[PDB]
Each structure stands twice: as structure tokens, then as C-alpha cells.
Amino acid sequence: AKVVCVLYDDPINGYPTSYARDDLPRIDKYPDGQTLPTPKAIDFTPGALLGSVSGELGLRKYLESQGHELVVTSSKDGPDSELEKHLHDAEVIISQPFWPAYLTAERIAKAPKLKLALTAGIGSDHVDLQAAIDNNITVAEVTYCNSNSVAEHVVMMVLGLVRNYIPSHDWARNGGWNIADCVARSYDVEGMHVGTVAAGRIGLRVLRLLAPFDMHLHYTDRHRLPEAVEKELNLTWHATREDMYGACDVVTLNCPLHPETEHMINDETLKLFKRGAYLVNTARGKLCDRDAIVRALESGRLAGYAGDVWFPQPAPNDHPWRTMPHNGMTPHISGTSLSAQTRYAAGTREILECYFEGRPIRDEYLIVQGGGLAGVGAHSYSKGNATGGSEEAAKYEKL
Amino acid sequence: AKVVCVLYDDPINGYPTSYARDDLPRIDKYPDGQTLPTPKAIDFTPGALLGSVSGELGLRKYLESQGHELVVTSSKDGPDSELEKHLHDAEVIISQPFWPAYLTAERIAKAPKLKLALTAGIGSDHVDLQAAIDNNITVAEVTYCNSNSVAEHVVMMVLGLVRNYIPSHDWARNGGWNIADCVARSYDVEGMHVGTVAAGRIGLRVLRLLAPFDMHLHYTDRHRLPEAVEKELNLTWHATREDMYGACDVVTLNCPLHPETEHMINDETLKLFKRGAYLVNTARGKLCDRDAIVRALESGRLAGYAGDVWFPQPAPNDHPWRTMPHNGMTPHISGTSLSAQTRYAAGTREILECYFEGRPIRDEYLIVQGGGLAGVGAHSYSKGNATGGSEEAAKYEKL
């Protein structure tokens, strides 16, 4: 069959064959006890760059030696992109969230041979789940591959915003000293209240990392955590998102994107935050109304915004979050550190091996199968389409 | 009497009277059970900028209403500075580590009336302790005022270096996306080995904050921690600094500066680190040989260096750490976040109230008294002078 694999470009200075360090650290398992990916074999060296076009997720030897054709490209947005020439006979489409091939209803409709949309990473909101349901496309993603990596990135951005890292590094590199300019907006997080929206693999992990900072922890979610967990971390529960925001100095979003959470942070909900609250979002950019966030920063309602997710992706060159006041943005990188890519590259192969030998794909990897939500998808997503507006990604130009 | 208070400049755009947030968080106590500062009263509002010349540590009403003269200045380095005109009759000299008035042996010798050198903050290595001992100057500092604040700053810089925050934010603000360029040097800290030199108030607190990241924790110090603590955090002990370095992916320095630790990190000791180790230093800049660190980064021996302390301070405009490859530097700001300044401003007043009413200064604040080390000073410092080279601070020019 044909596999289209959409990956991001290689570094601007070429694809490296040697790295800052020699190996990755050992990891035996994930916190809830889920095993790591178990492909029958891997053909890449752990620690390399796997998610760019020249890395290929290490899938080429495997795929060809079995008769299939692997098309690799970064060209994905716009009516004359490479993805668009290959839709007519694609059996399998693979993309990562960081550089997502948006499978809208019109793209699925052009794709008669399409059986499997695979997300190399976590979060499958860049596929129209309704259309995937209607056309019997399987949708899978690599559960847990980077949950802990995302949680680290959250804590990094919370400390960075609150202590004012980025502007302070600028004063050091431009030759200044400027202590008062740096600490005019520098606080400790000790004693602050921080809440997470959702406390699944990422959000629970965030709570556990912030406990020894002596922050007061707050959460909300569909269901409560086990009473053992709440008493271990001394948690304060809020029955709704909207009651949580007013109680928090720092809010972190860690829920999925679907019609029930699209634009939940807007001009109306921002009125509920404390003046000078801090907001961190590494979940999905579309959880926030884009201009409402710039107004809150400009007015002082928010003291700081930080995240690595944007809508669409890539974000147009003039996307306002790039230059708004008091921001600690990065491009979408938390779930594609070198350490994570090796786990998701392995998981991607494990799903392909199952697909191609006719074995069942692990439930924890499933989002959509056989005309409805399935596996992890059933507990996390609503039927619906989040991919409207996605065309605007075609406006981005490489530097 | 006369009090000279050396403080850093106000912000370049003036001294603000309103801030990003309305109050500071509550804190009742420090982890080892030490009480907060207990001055009989304070005359500043918590949360304001206290450490710059216009803030004055909130000490003016108190000092004058009791007959004393308060001289406030930022002019401190060089043979024609304001500190230098006021040495002849100064009874009390106050400075913070971030903007330190260096009391060398020659400066103490010009200071016949000098009875008390007070450090508003932590770390009194900018005073020549030998000369202070020889001339019967009392040296006190505000123990614990910002221990937790420094520990937060360490974790922030560890995550920032390792996940590659700073270069990634640059790609977002310059209009790029550039995922591969960002993650070419991006790892998770999960599973890495991290060691601290010294495990006192800061270093133990760092270990506790890194435990739930599932890092493997290593330490060294003068004496072991209680076996209860080692088993709680699953610690690996190293009897010497030099044995620790080779076992660690990430090394953090959290010890005092004195002749026994001056230049401990040099061309010779750097050969002992793992290739592509990460080094974070928020203790004192003089712990490191300045050029040896730039060579290790240039050769790949170190994958990253980060810290907020420099020697001298302020660092000359062309100090090499400002522009060396793979650095996450800031100017010296960790122990002077707004939250910390309120605790040290309070402690400074408590020491002055004691001094002036003839009550004993708390032992935990004492470094030098009556011809020898005393209090905290006895357990932490050697007799000796760390202030050689300090004159070079006069080369720094405001932007």
C-alpha cells in the first residue's frame, strides 16, 4: 500500500548525524503502569532526530521490505501541496501535532483508499473526527509517548513567566545588568494557587511536580480523582472550570480540543480570572480565542501568557501571540524533544506492524474505529470537527 | 550614627508605584522551622520595589526618627564613587549581593567608625572576612530570606537549558516555526542524574523540587544528611565533589564562596564531567574559572551553562559569559524577586533595631562577630578573602 508521512523540515543548517549527548536516559514504564511501545523491532538509533523529513520516523526499511511505498514530505498546507497530490491513493496518513496534516471533511472525501490516520504524538484534533467516523477511517495516536515531556514543559513555563526569565536573559545578552528592570515583574511561585483544567496523564503529573514548590493545588475535570490522590496532594476540587479560575494565581490548560472546549478562554471567561493571573497552555491553541488573549495582556487582566501551541500550525508569521506583551511562547515543541521522538517513533511502528499483519491495535492507542469513538477516544473526545480555519496555515513562509 | 545603604538603580523608565499583582502570597515560616523576620514594625508595603535606590529597604522613617543619617546610593565601584566619600564616618554599611559594595581590606582600613557590615540577602563573600575579623566589624546577613527563591530559580534554569527554551522563544518571536532547529538540542530531564554541591537550605530544597521529575538524585557536602532524608529521596552520596561530577548529567552548585571553593570548576575539574553535561550555578560566579567555562562550551564538554551569578558584579559589558554558546544566563536576580525583597527588607530592619537598642542579633543572622566567625558563619565559611579582582566592576557602563 501507499503510506504518506508528513514531517517537519530538517534544521536550517542541515541534518546532523551527531548530537549534544551520546544516549538517552533509561525509562522502564509509564506512571499508570502502561508499557512502553513494543514494536517487534526498530531501525533508528535512539536519540536521533526522527520527526523531520530526513529522519522518517525510522520507518523506511520496514515499510519497503514489505512491499509498501513511503512518501515523505513537509509540504502539507494549501491547494497545491504534496499531501494534496497523494490523497487519491493513500492507504495510511501519518503526521505529528507539531506539523499537522489537517484531514478536513473535504480531504477525507478525496481519499477513497484511506483506512488509517495515525498521529505520531498525542492529540488528534487536527483530523475531522466526525468525517473519520462517517467514512470508517481508523484514527490512532501514541498514548503516553510524551505525557511526561509535556508536564515538564508546563512547569518550565510557569517558573519562566512568574520569575520573568526571558526579558532578564535579554538584559544579560545585550550587555546590561538592570536588576530593577528584571525584578519589577519577578515573583516566587511559593504560596501561589495554581489550578489545572483536567487532571489526566499530563494534568495529574503537573500537580505532582508543583507539590514540593509549596503551591496550593486546585483542579477541575469531568470526574473527581480517587480520594487517596486528593488527600496525598491536598487538592481543592472545583466542580466547574469557571469556578476554578477566580481561585487561582496560575492556571494551566491540559484538556483535549473538541467542540465542548473550543474557545473556552474568551473575553467573557477572562473576566473571571484574578487581576494579574498567569495563564499557561500546552494543550491546544484553539482552546483560546486568539485576540481575547492579546486584550487581556494589554489591559493587565493577565500578567503573563505562555504556551507552545497555536492555531493553526504553523502559525502565520504575523500571528499576534508572537509579539504580544509578557509572553513566553515557543513553537510547538514540548512533545517532540529527542527523548519523546524515540518513544513515539517506536509506537508508530508498533501500530503499523499491527495494522499490516491484521492484529488488533492496542486499545489505549485507539481514538476512532469502526464507525465510532473507541479506546482512549471514548473517554476524552466528543464527536465533532475542530479543523475549521486550518487553511490559514498556508499563509506561513519559511524564514 | 551614619548608615550608608548601597542599592541598585531604579528601573530605566522610572520607579513604579503600582505592580502586576496586588499582594504577595502568605508564608508562615521557613522549612527547618525558622521564624520569618520579626522587626517591631515595617514602613513599606509588601510587594513593592524595595532594593532600588528609591525603595530604600523602607528604612528612612525608622532611621531618622532615631537621630541617624541615611545615605542612599548606587554609586559603589571605582576610586571616585559615593561609597568611597562616605567610608570615613560610616557606622553601618548595607548592600545586597545583586549590587554588592565590596568591602576590601583597604576599604575597611579607611573606615574607623565602621561597626556593622549588613548583607541584605544571603552570601557575604563580597566583604573581606579576614579584615572584618581583624578589625572587629560585625558581619550579619538575612538567613533564609530567599533560600526557597534561589531553589526555584535553579529548577527553572535546569528545565530551560535542558529543554532548550531560550533559542526556541527566539524562533517564535522572530516569526519562525523551525521545530527541528529547536529540538535538535531538546531533551526531557526525566531519568537524568543531577547532583548538588552542598545540600544546605538551597541544595536540599533543589533535591526535593527535582524528586517528582523522576531524576536520580546525587549529592555531596561537608557532612551527610540524616539517614531519614537519604532514604526519603533515595539519595546517592559522594564523599567528594570530584567523584560526583562524573556520575551526573546535570550539576548544580549551591555552596558558599571562600578560599576552599574559589575556582573549583576549572580546566582541570571540567575534564571530570560527562560529555554534554549541564552546569547550573546560582551560588557565586567566582566558584568557576571564567574562561574555562567558555572553552568547555566551545568544545562540547558542557552542553549548556546557566546561572545568575557573575564575578565581579556588575559584570563588565563584554564579560564573555554574556555571549558564549548555549547559555541561559541572567543578571543576579534570583534572591531579589519582589516576594524575597519583603522578607529581606524586614530582616534588615530587625538587625538594625537590635544593633541600635543594644540587644543581641539572632545567631542565625551572624557571620562574623567579636574577632571570629560566629553563628551561621562558623558552619559555612573559612577565614579568608574572596574579593580580589573586584575592582573590575568599575568597567561596567549603564546602557
TrEMBL record, chains A, B:
<feature type="binding site">
    <location>
        <position position="221"/>
    </location>
    <ligand>
        <name>NAD(+)</name>
    </ligand>
</feature>
<feature type="binding site">
    <location>
        <position position="260"/>
    </location>
    <ligand>
        <name>NAD(+)</name>
    </ligand>
</feature>
<feature type="binding site">
    <location>
        <position position="380"/>
    </location>
    <ligand>
        <name>NAD(+)</name>
    </ligand>
</feature>
<feature type="binding site">
    <location>
        <position position="334"/>
    </location>
    <ligand>
        <name>NAD(+)</name>
    </ligand>
</feature>
<feature type="binding site">
    <location>
        <position position="147"/>
    </location>
    <ligand>
        <name>NAD(+)</name>
    </ligand>
</feature>
<feature type="binding site">
    <location>
        <position position="201"/>
    </location>
    <ligand>
        <name>NAD(+)</name>
    </ligand>
</feature>
<keyword id="KW-0547">Nucleotide-binding</keyword>
<protein>
    <submittedName>
        <fullName>NAD-dependent formate dehydrogenase</fullName>
        <ecNumber>1.2.1.2</ecNumber>
    </submittedName>
</protein>
<feature type="binding site">
    <location>
        <position position="202"/>
    </location>
    <ligand>
        <name>NAD(+)</name>
    </ligand>
</feature>
<keyword id="KW-0560">Oxidoreductase</keyword>
<feature type="binding site">
    <location>
        <position position="258"/>
    </location>
    <ligand>
        <name>NAD(+)</name>
    </ligand>
</feature>
